[PDB]
Amino acid sequence: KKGVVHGVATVAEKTKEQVTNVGGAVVTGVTAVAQKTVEGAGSIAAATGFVKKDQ
Amino acid sequence: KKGVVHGVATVAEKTKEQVTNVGGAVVTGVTAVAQKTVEGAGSIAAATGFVKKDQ
Amino acid sequence: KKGVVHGVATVAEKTKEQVTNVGGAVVTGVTAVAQKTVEGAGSIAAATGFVKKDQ
Amino acid sequence: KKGVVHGVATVAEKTKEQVTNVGGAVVTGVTAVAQKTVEGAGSIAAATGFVKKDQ
Amino acid sequence: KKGVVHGVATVAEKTKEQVTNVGGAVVTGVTAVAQKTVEGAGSIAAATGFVKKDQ
Amino acid sequence: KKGVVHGVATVAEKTKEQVTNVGGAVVTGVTAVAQKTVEGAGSIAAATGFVKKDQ
Amino acid sequence: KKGVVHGVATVAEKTKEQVTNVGGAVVTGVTAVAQKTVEGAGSIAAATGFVKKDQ
Amino acid sequence: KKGVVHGVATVAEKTKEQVTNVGGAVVTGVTAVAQKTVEGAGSIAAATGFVKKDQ
Amino acid sequence: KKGVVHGVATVAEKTKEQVTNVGGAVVTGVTAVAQKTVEGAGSIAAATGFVKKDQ
Amino acid sequence: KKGVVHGVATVAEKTKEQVTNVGGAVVTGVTAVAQKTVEGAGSIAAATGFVKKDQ
Ligand SMILES: CNc1ccc(C#C/C=C/c2nc3ccc(O)cc3s2)cn1
Ligand SMILES: CNc1ccc(C#C/C=C/c2nc3ccc(O)cc3s2)cn1
Ligand SMILES: CNc1ccc(C#C/C=C/c2nc3ccc(O)cc3s2)cn1
Ligand SMILES: CNc1ccc(C#C/C=C/c2nc3ccc(O)cc3s2)cn1
Ligand SMILES: CNc1ccc(C#C/C=C/c2nc3ccc(O)cc3s2)cn1
Ligand SMILES: CNc1ccc(C#C/C=C/c2nc3ccc(O)cc3s2)cn1
Ligand SMILES: CNc1ccc(C#C/C=C/c2nc3ccc(O)cc3s2)cn1
Ligand SMILES: CNc1ccc(C#C/C=C/c2nc3ccc(O)cc3s2)cn1
Ligand SMILES: CNc1ccc(C#C/C=C/c2nc3ccc(O)cc3s2)cn1
Ligand SMILES: CNc1ccc(C#C/C=C/c2nc3ccc(O)cc3s2)cn1
Ligand SMILES: CNc1ccc(C#C/C=C/c2nc3ccc(O)cc3s2)cn1
Ligand SMILES: CNc1ccc(C#C/C=C/c2nc3ccc(O)cc3s2)cn1
Ligand SMILES: CNc1ccc(C#C/C=C/c2nc3ccc(O)cc3s2)cn1
Ligand SMILES: CNc1ccc(C#C/C=C/c2nc3ccc(O)cc3s2)cn1
Ligand SMILES: CNc1ccc(C#C/C=C/c2nc3ccc(O)cc3s2)cn1
Ligand SMILES: CNc1ccc(C#C/C=C/c2nc3ccc(O)cc3s2)cn1
Ligand SMILES: CNc1ccc(C#C/C=C/c2nc3ccc(O)cc3s2)cn1
Ligand SMILES: CNc1ccc(C#C/C=C/c2nc3ccc(O)cc3s2)cn1
Ligand SMILES: CNc1ccc(C#C/C=C/c2nc3ccc(O)cc3s2)cn1
Ligand SMILES: CNc1ccc(C#C/C=C/c2nc3ccc(O)cc3s2)cn1
């Protein structure tokens, strides 16, 4: 076989899960957050996949 | 087989799940948030997939 | 087989779920948010798939 | 088989769900939000798929 | 076989999970956060995959 | 002060919410159920406050 | 002060929430159920407060 | 002060929450269930407060 | 002070939370269940407070 | 002071939390369950407070 990509690719066979991202956010997984009190200014309480590039 | 992509591709066979994103947000997964009190200015309480690029 | 894409494609066979996004938001998954009090100015309380690019 | 796309495509066979988006928003999934009080100026309380590009 | 990529690629066969990211965040895994009180200004309470590049 | 009750009482001051029940059902709280398919014979799908005393 | 009860009482001061139950069910709290498919005969899918005393 | 109870009482001062139960079920707390597929005959999927006394 | 109870009592002062139960179930706490697939006959998947006295 | 109980009592002062139980189940605490697949016949997957007295 032959393949040429510029990116971003994701090429496969017999594949149970696939995610391609440029951005941005993708949530595909099981996630449970239980929480009782959030205070403070300002605290990232429960972050799973996170990116902060403030300018 | 032969394939040429510019991106972003996601090419496969026999594949249970697929996500392609440029952006942007995609939520495809099970997610449960239970929460009782959020305060503060300003706190990211429960973030799963998150991207902040303020300018 | 043969395939040429410019992107963004999502090409497959025998595939249970598919999402293609450029944007933008796509919500296809099970999601439960239970919440009791949100305060503060301004706090992202419960974000699942999120993108903030304010200029 | 043969396929040439400019994007955004989503090509498949035997496929239970499909979403193609350029925009924009698509909501196809089960979603339950229960909520008791939202305050503050201005806090994104419960966001599932979200994109904010204010200029 | 032959392959030439510019990156970022992810090329495979017989592959159970795949993630390609440029960004950005991708959450595909099981995650449980249980939490009782978050205070302080400002403390990253529970971060799993995290990136902070404030300027 | 003095108080004598036989029950069921609920005596208070400065009190935001009150429920007294003998029975019977009382629903006073925020509740959101989103649901896509219920089958089976016979399965309690989503029960919040529930009591079954069949004889 | 003086108090004599037979039960069930609930006596208080300065009290934000109160529930008295003999029965029976009382739902006063925030509750979110999101659900996609329930099958089987017969499975209690999502039960929060539950009591089964079949005879 | 003086108090004589037969039960079940709940006597207090300056008290934020109160529950008295004989039964029966009382749900006063924040609860989020997100769920994607329930099968089997018969499986208690997600039970929070639960009592089964079948005879 | 003086107190005589038969039970079940719960007597206090300056008390943030109170639960009295004979039964029966009481759910007053924050709870998040996220779940993707339940099978089998019959498996208690996610039980928090649970009592099974089948005869 | 003087106190005589038959049980079950719970007598206190200046007390943040109280639970009295005869039964039965009481859930007052923060709890997060995230789960991806449950199989088998029949396996207690995730049990927090649990009692099984089948006869
Ligand atoms: C009797 N039970 C009680 C009594 C008090 C409390 C409480 C509280 C939180 C207080 C906070 N103050 C600030 C001030 C500045 C800031 O940036 C963040 C915070 S959070 C809970 N239970
Ligand atoms: C002022 N600040 C900024 C911020 C971001 C940028 C940018 C950019 C370009 C992003 C691209 N992504 C892809 C993905 C796939 C593909 O095939 C081609 C491209 S080009 C410029 N200035
Ligand atoms: C008797 N039970 C009670 C009594 C009080 C409370 C409470 C509270 C929260 C107070 C806050 N103050 C500020 C001030 C500034 C700011 O930026 C954020 C916050 S949050 C809960 N239960
Ligand atoms: C002022 N700030 C900004 C911010 C963003 C940008 C930008 C951009 C371009 C994004 C593109 N995405 C794709 C995706 C697929 C494809 O085949 C071609 C392209 S080109 C410029 N200035
Ligand atoms: C007796 N039970 C009670 C009594 C009081 C309360 C409460 C409260 C919240 C107070 C807040 N103050 C500010 C001030 C500034 C700001 O930016 C945000 C906030 S939130 C709850 N239960
Ligand atoms: C709706 N408008 C707004 C306004 C502001 C925001 C925000 C934010 C996040 C601020 C953070 N600061 C710190 C400092 C130190 C550290 O280690 C981690 C962090 S995260 C979101 N939306
Ligand atoms: C109209 N219908 C269709 C049908 C098929 C297609 C397609 C395609 C792309 C196939 C590729 N295969 C490989 C293999 C290896 C590699 O490194 C890169 C690539 S890209 C589009 N439209
Ligand atoms: C002032 N700020 C901004 C912000 C965004 C932009 C932009 C843009 C272009 C987006 C494109 N998306 C696609 C997707 C598929 C495709 O085949 C071609 C294209 S071109 C410019 N200025
Ligand atoms: C001032 N700000 C902005 C904001 C957005 C834009 C833009 C744009 C173009 C979007 C396109 N989408 C598609 C999708 C499919 C396709 O085949 C061709 C195209 S071109 C410009 N200025
Ligand atoms: C009687 N039970 C109680 C009594 C008090 C409390 C409490 C508390 C938290 C206080 C905080 N103060 C600050 C001040 C500045 C800051 O940046 C962060 C924080 S968090 C809990 N239980
Ligand atoms: C055949 N099966 C059953 C089932 C239930 C019963 C029963 C009963 C009695 C329940 C009572 N509750 C209260 C509550 C308060 C009070 O002051 C007095 C009473 S007496 C009998 N047979
Ligand atoms: C109508 N209003 C009221 C007012 C008060 C009451 C009451 C009461 C019970 C108080 C007790 N104190 C103690 C102290 C020590 C000990 O070992 C056992 C006990 S029992 C009922 N109804
Ligand atoms: C055949 N099976 C069953 C099942 C249940 C029963 C029973 C019973 C009695 C329950 C009572 N609860 C209270 C609560 C408060 C109070 O002051 C007095 C009473 S008496 C009998 N047979
Ligand atoms: C192509 N996508 C598909 C195809 C099939 C299905 C499905 C299904 C469920 C089948 C069941 N059979 C039984 C039999 C007996 C019983 O007691 C309970 C059940 S539930 C979902 N998506
Ligand atoms: C609507 N009707 C019905 C009918 C049946 C049921 C039931 C049930 C539970 C059965 C269990 N068996 C086992 C065996 C072994 C073990 O370790 C744990 C458990 S839990 C509920 N509702
Ligand atoms: C056939 N099986 C069963 C099952 C249960 C029973 C029973 C019973 C009695 C329960 C009581 N609870 C309270 C609570 C408070 C109080 O002050 C007095 C009482 S008496 C009998 N037979
Ligand atoms: C192609 N995607 C697919 C294909 C098939 C399925 C499925 C399924 C479930 C099958 C079950 N069979 C039984 C039989 C007896 C019983 O008591 C319970 C169950 S549950 C999901 N996705
Ligand atoms: C056939 N199987 C069974 C099963 C259970 C029983 C039983 C019983 C009695 C339970 C009681 N609880 C309390 C709690 C407080 C109090 O002040 C008095 C009592 S008496 C009998 N037979
Ligand atoms: C291609 N993707 C697929 C294919 C198949 C499946 C599946 C499945 C579950 C099968 C079960 N069979 C039984 C039989 C008896 C019983 O008591 C419980 C169960 S659960 C998921 N994804
Ligand atoms: C291609 N991806 C796949 C393929 C297959 C599966 C699977 C599975 C589970 C099979 C089970 N069989 C039994 C039989 C009896 C019993 O009591 C419990 C169970 S659970 C997941 N992913």
Query: In 3D, which of C5, G7, B14, J34 has the Cα closest to residue I37?
Result: J34
By the 8 A CB rule, do D52 and C53 touch?
Answer: yes
In a domain, G14, yes or no: yes
Euclidean distance between CA atoms G43 and G55, whole angstroms: 19
Query: Residues I3, J3: contact at Cβ < 8 Å?
Result: yes
The alpha carbon of residue I43 and the mean position of all alpha carbons in its chain are separated, in whole angstroms, by 20
SS3 A52: strand
Contact between H10 and I20 (Cβ < 8 Å): yes
User: Token pair for residue C7?
Assistant: 């992107």
Q: Which DSSP string corresponds to F3-39? A: EE--S---B-SS-S--EE-SSSEEE-S-EEEE-S-B-
**CA proximity to H52, closest of F26, J53, I46, J40:** J53
Mark out the alpha helices in chain E (DSSP H runs): none
Nearest to B26 by CA among E50, G36, D26, E52: D26
Residues of chain H that touch chain J, judged by Cβ-Cβ distance less than 8 Å = 8, 29, 40, 43, 46, 48-51
In DSSP notation, C2-48 reads EEE--S---B-SS-S--EE-SSSEEE-S-EEEE-S-B-SSS---EEE
Nearest to H28 by CA among D12, E42, G29, E1: G29
Look at residue H20 and tell me if it is in a domain.
yes
Tokens 């590009």 map to which residue?
D53
Long-range CB pairs of E39-43, under 8 A, 24+ apart, other chains included: E39/A39, E39/A40, E39/A43, E40/A39, E40/A40, E40/A43, E41/A40, E41/A41, E41/A42, E41/A43, E41/B40, E42/A40, E42/A41, E42/A42, E42/A43, E42/A44, E42/B43, E43/A40, E43/A43
User: Quick one: closest CA in B to D16, which residue?
Assistant: B16
User: Could you tell me the CA-to-CA distances from A48 to A11, A32, B12, D32, E18 in Å, in that order?
Assistant: 26, 11, 28, 21, 18
* Beta bridge mates, C34: B34, D34
Give the separation between CA A20 and CA A9, rounded to whole angstroms: 7
Is the bond preceding I40 in cis, omega lying within 30 degrees of 0? Answer: no
DSSP state of G38: B
How far does the centroid of ligand 18 lie from the alpha carbon of residue I24, in Å? 13
* H34 closest CB neighbour out of B31, B35, B36: B31
Sheet of A2-4: strand order equals: D2-4, C2-4, B2-4, A2-4, E2-4
- Taking a C-beta distance cutoff of 8 angstroms, is the pair F36, G35 a contact? yes
Contact list, D37 vs chain C (CB under 8 Å) = 36-38
Compare all CA atoms of chain H with the CA of B28 and give the residue at the minimum distance.
H36
Per the structure, how many domains does chain F have? Answer: 1
Question: What is the I23 CA–ligand 13 centroid distance (Å)?
Answer: 10
For the record, the structure tokens of I31 come out as 């709870």
> Does I54 fall in a domain?
no
Q: Does residue F33 form part of some domain?
A: yes
Asked, for residue H52, whether it belongs to a domain, the answer is: no
- For tokens 């605290």, the residue is A43
DSSP secondary-structure letter at J31?
E
Measure in Å the smallest separation between the Cα of F29 and chain D Cα atoms.
8
Give the pairing type, strands D46-49 and F25-27: unpaired
CB I17 within 8 A of CB G15: no
The SS3 assignment for A38 reads strand
Query: Rounded to whole angstroms, how far apart are CA atoms J36 and I10?
Result: 40
Cα separation, B24 vs C50, whole angstroms: 7
Q: Which of E11, E27, E30 to mutate: most B Cβ within 10 Å?
A: E27
The structure tokens listed for I25 are 């179930």
* DSSP-assigned states of every residue in H7-53: S---B-SS-S--EE-SSSEEE-S-EEEEES-B-SSS---EEEE--B-
| Beta carbons of G52 and H51 less than 8 angstroms apart | yes
Q: Tell the residue nearest (CA) to atom 22 of ligand 20.
A: A16
> Residue B19: which of C20, E22, D16 has the closest Cα?
C20
Q: Do C and J have ≥3 inter-chain CB pairs under 8 A? A: no
The verdict on residue H1 lying in a domain is yes
Residue A32 to residue I36, Cβ atoms within 8 A:
no
Q: With CB atoms and an 8 Å threshold, state whether H41 touches F40.
A: yes
- Cβ atoms of A27 and C49 within 8 Å: the answer is yes
In Å, how far are C29, C33, D46, F1, I11 from B32, measured between CA atoms? 11, 6, 12, 47, 36
Closest-CA distance, J27 to chain H, in angstroms, reads 6
Distance from the first to the final alpha carbon of chain C: 45
Query: What does the block give as tokens for G7?
Result: 């039960």
Q: State how far the Cα of E31 lies from the Cα of I8, in Å rounded to an integer.
A: 39
Handedness of CA D23, D24, D25, D26 (dihedral sign): negative
Query: Which 8-state DSSP code applies to residue E25?
Result: E
- Whether the ω angle into residue D49 lies within 30 degrees of 0, i.e. cis, is no
**C-alpha to C-alpha distances, F26 to B36, F12, F18, F23, I24, nearest whole angstrom:** 22, 19, 11, 9, 16
Binding-site residues, ligand 10, Cβ < 6 A: A 39-40; E 39-41
Is there a domain that residue I53 lies in?
no
H/E stretch holding G33 reads strand G31-35
Is G39 within the bounds of a domain? Answer: yes
Question: Of the candidates I1, F9, A28, J1, which has an alpha carbon nearest to the alpha carbon of residue C26?
Answer: A28
What are residue J46's DSSP bridge partners?
A: I46
Domain that holds residue H36: 1-47
Question: Do chains F and G touch by CB distance (3+ pairs < 8 Å)?
Answer: yes
Q: Using most ligand atoms within 8 A of CB, pick from C11, C15, C18, C20 the residue to mutate for ligand 7.
A: C11
d(CA H13, CA I16): 9
3-state secondary structure of D34: strand
